[PDB]
């Protein structure tokens, strides 16, 4: 197979110059297991895609709901003993906690010891995101600005 694993995850249809941020974010190097990253491979419809292969390791909820907001294109594949036990795409959540950082300078989230939380409306335009604290809603792009 275009690389291979018994148990584990293989994420595919990752946008170019997204796989490396994903390696960063989900801490995928804090791991002792084999990893294959196919940076900036192809994808017939959308030219090049990055692909990551976490051997005998699977992702938790948090990470995939993140993965939705960072990659609504990717498809995450549960491989046990080489059979793709399941190959599932992400659907957005209700609410993202503790990774987004509120655009509002005067948001209390900053100064005080609290894990953030954001509410997610799916705007026909994009993804509107609302702070738990200041109640300001933002464009997903305003927020995800790396």
């Amino acid at each position: 197979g275009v690389e291979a694993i018994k148990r584990g995850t293989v994420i595919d249809h990752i946008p170019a110059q997204i796989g490396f941020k994903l390696l960063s974010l989900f801490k995928l190097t804090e791991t002792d297991q084999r990893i294959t990253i196919g940076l900036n491979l192809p994808s017939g419809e959308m030219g090049r895609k990055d692909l990551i292969k976490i051997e005998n390791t699977f992702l938790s909820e948090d990470q995939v709901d993140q993965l939705a907001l960072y990659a609504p294109q990717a498809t995450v594949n549960r491989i046990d003993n080489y059979e793709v036990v399941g190959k599932s795409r992400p659907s957005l959540p209700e609410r993202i906690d503790n990774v987004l950082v509120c655009p509002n300078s005067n948001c209390i989230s900053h100064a005080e010891p609290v894990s953030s939380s954001f509410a997610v409306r799916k705007r026909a335009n994009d993804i509107a995101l609302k702070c738990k604290y200041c109640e300001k809603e933002f464009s997903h792009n305003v927020v995800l600005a790396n």
Partner: protein, 310 residues
């Protein structure tokens, strides 16, 4: 057992058409017949981390007229948050080991919601958080609108001023969107305009709003003209082009106004309502201020008493 008993009164969004009407019904009642020891043996925290004359002094006088006791501060300057450097989370924690409900004003948005995550059992009632929510304002405004118009459905309400940073107008456009058939008219400097999030919601519920450059262009159609202050203290440097009031009401402009029409203003007001308006049968912001005693008495009664019979 009553519905607002033990509730945190943070955002108008959280409160419903009926929680709102329950307060006003209560209000009219403590205004009709007073309850001087309803809250006898309750101690309440007045925590003002930001300046106030009305919200703190109304809230405090309410507490006294119901027999409750007050403890608090007028500024963090003196606290150990403001001098020894403790967090607000820790501050709300020990203060909730002391009192029965916490009233707080606070310069950052969302402080209020943060307080609840640390108050345990004690109800937290928001006196204003930066430019976000001011729900106790709204209740007294709803009370004052009811008294004058006899209805909270189908009005023509004009909001004039700093709509961006105004927490009063945020809370008020959200409670009135809970009633039927209300027409809105926003008159702001566009750099100090109504947040699109409120507008989205107004659109999501099929309510009608409209922007206008004049006040004379709407005087004729309104029931309530709600004036606001430019929030100097909240303005960003880009906005200093916007400190002095754009639209300023004078007694002469009221000339083609509906006789029922009232001028409401949260207060303080700077230069935006000329004092000649104060001598008219349209001026009403001082009456409105008085009505803050009855809606804050109502709300304390409801959160701290499990059943009210009055």
């Amino acid at each position: 057992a009553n519905p607002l008993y033990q509730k945190h009164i943070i955002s108008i969004n959280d409160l419903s058409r009926d929680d709102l009407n329950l307060v006003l019904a209560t209000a009219a009642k403590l205004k009709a017949n007073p309850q001087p020891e309803l809250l006898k043996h309750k101690v309440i925290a007045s925590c003002f981390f930001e300046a106030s004359t009305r919200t703190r002094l109304s809230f405090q006088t309410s507490m006294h007229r119901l027999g409750a006791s007050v403890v608090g501060f007028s500024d963090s300057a003196n606290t150990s948050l403001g001098k020894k450097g403790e967090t607000l989370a820790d501050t709300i924690s020990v203060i909730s080991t002391y009192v029965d409900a916490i009233v707080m004003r606070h310069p950052q948005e969302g402080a209020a919601r943060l307080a609840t995550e640390f108050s345990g059992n004690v109800p937290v009632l928001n006196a204003g958080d930066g430019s976000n929510q001011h729900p106790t304002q709204t209740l007294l405004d709803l009370f004052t609108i009811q008294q004058t118009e006899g209805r909270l459905d189908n009005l023509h309400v004009a909001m004039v001023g700093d709509l961006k940073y105004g927490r009063t107008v945020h809370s008020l456009t959200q409670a009135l969107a809970k009633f039927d058939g209300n027409r809105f008219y926003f008159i702001a400097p566009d750099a100090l305009a109504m947040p699109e999030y409120i507008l989205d919601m107004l659109d999501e519920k099929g309510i009608a709003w409209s922007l206008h450059s004049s006040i004379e262009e709407v005087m004729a159609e309104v029931d309530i003209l709600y004036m606001t202050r430019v929030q100097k203290e909240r303005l960003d440097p880009s906005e200093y082009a916007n400190v002095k009031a754009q639209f300023v009401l004078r007694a002469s402009d009221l000339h083609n106004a509906k006789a029922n029409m009232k001028v409401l203003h949260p207060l303080p007001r700077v230069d935006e309502i000329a004092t000649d308006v104060d001598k008219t049968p349209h001026a009403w912001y001082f009456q409105q201020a008085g009505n803050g005693i009855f809606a804050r008495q109502a709300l304390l009664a409801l959160v701290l008493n499990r059943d009210l019979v009055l």
